[PDB]
């Protein structure tokens, strides 16, 4: 509706403390939630619809009537650990807006100037007796001309330090591998996301270089991992892989690098299984690549 108070005081205030589902989280950055809610002790976030509440009684009446128990979209991936839901921003406007309002509380460079229409939201969840619980997500432009396979990526604070951030990145490149396109995350990464990406870049690189045996090319590395040639050479510089010895360029896999390779093979970290990815790239027409009217 067009019913908004022109004399309503507009003051920037972060939320005191949110209660998403069973966890009590403290927001780090400002998110444009309703001005009335920014001056409340507790805000309730439904962990299924991501709807915000300032009144506990309303959150009770909402919970007793809400029948949604999983992200409103098609399940494109599911193993015995986590599941992935593909959600269109133009189809699920209400849900995607609530996700962006929630995500802005913890993303400093995320912006809500425009609507969620031009974005595809891939949400990673954990199935439970109650249903699928959102633990993290990464947004993706519908048809990125800049080759950005990840716009904004976030793992919820109550599910941090559990390897979920590495799964979002790995699943993001897995979608790019299915699209037969190279990709790179959107340029202004946060401190937390930058470290997680440097970890994924170095680990998947050393695993590939060791097992390849045959002579490799920079363009071929980009074909197998869907990483951009810039990210590959930057990862090759972070490590001491690339050396120019006696008038020619070679790859050096020294023992210190091979020690991290041996640790990775014995480690039992969660990985994405491509065989459980039942997903064909969405096809948009010229009319569909516009804001809804």
């Amino acid at each position: 509706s067009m019913t908004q108070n022109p004399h309503e005081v507009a003051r920037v205030r972060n939320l005191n403390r949110i209660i998403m589902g069973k966890y009590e989280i403290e927001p780090w950055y400002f998110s444009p939630y309703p001005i009335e809610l920014t001056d409340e002790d507790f805000i309730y976030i439904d962990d299924f619809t991501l709807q915000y509440f300032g009144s506990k009684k309303q959150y009770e009446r909402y919970r007793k009537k809400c029948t949604l128990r999983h992200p409103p979209g098609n399940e494109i991936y599911r193993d015995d650990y986590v599941s992935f839901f593909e959600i269109d921003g133009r189809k699920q406007r209400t849900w995607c807006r609530n996700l962006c309002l929630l995500s802005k509380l913890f993303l400093d460079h995320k912006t809500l100037y425009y609507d969620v229409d031009p974005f595809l939201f891939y949400c990673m969840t954990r199935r439970d007796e109650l249903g699928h619980h959102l633990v993290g997500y990464f947004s993706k432009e519908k048809e990125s001309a800049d080759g950005y396979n990840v716009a904004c990526i976030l793992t919820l604070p109550q599910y941090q330090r559990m390897g979920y951030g590495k799964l979002l990145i790995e699943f993001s490149y897995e979608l790019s591998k299915k699209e037969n396109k190279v990709g790179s995350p959107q340029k202004p990464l946060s401190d937390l996301g930058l470290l997680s990406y440097r970890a994924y870049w170095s680990d998947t690189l050393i695993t590939l270089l060791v097992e390849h045996q045959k002579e490799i090319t920079i363009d071929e590395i980009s074909s197998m991992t869907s990483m951009t040639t810039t990210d590959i050479l930057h990862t090759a510089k972070t490590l001491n892989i690339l050396r120019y010895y006696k008038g020619q360029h070679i790859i050096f896999l020294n023992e210190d690098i091979l020690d991290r390779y041996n640790r990775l093979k014995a480690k039992k970290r969660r990985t994405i299984d491509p065989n459980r990815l039942i997903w064909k790239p969405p096809v948009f027409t010229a009319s569909q690549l516009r804001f809804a009217w």
């Binding site: 995320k110 912006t111 100037y113 425009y114 432009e141 800049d146 716009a151 959107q186 202004p188």
Partner: peptide, 5 residues
């Protein structure tokens, strides 16, 4: 723009 700023 691009979801970042």
């Amino acid at each position: 723009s691009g979801a970042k700023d």
